[PDB]
């Protein structure tokens, strides 16, 4: 539980240098993916004038 809390707070004893993990990956997702999804969403996606 202490190790999990440390990983949550970014104080993990060991860092997975192989790939992004922990709080850093969570922040990267919440920023990049969220921004891309918001930009890609069409405010009026789908309309028919007729």
Partner 1 sequence: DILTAIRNATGPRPALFVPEVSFELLVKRQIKRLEEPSLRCVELVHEEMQRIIQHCSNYSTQELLRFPKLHDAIVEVVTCLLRKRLPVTNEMVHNLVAIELAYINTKHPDFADACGLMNNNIEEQRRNRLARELPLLDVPVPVARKLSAREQRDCEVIERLIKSYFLIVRKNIQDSVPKAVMHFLVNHVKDTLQSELV
Positions touching partner 1 (CB under 8 A) are 9-17, 20-24, 26-27, 30
Distance (Å, whole) CA 4 – CA 17: 18
Indicate the residue among 24 and 36 with the shorter CB distance to partner 1: 24
Q: How far is the CB of 31 from partner 1 (least distance, A)?
A: 8
Question: Could you tell me the smallest distance in angstroms from the CB atom of residue 35 to partner 1?
Answer: 14
Which CB atom, from 19 or from 42, has the smaller least distance to partner 1?
Answer: 19
Beta carbons within 8 Å of 19's beta carbon, 6+ residues apart: 25
């Amino acid at each position: 539980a202490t190790e999990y809390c440390n990983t949550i707070e970014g104080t993990a004893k060991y860092i997975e240098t192989s790939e992004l993990c922990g709080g850093a990956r969570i922040c990267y997702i919440f920023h990049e993916t969220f921004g891309r999804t918001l930009e890609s969403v069409d405010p009026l996606g789908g309309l028919n004038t007729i």
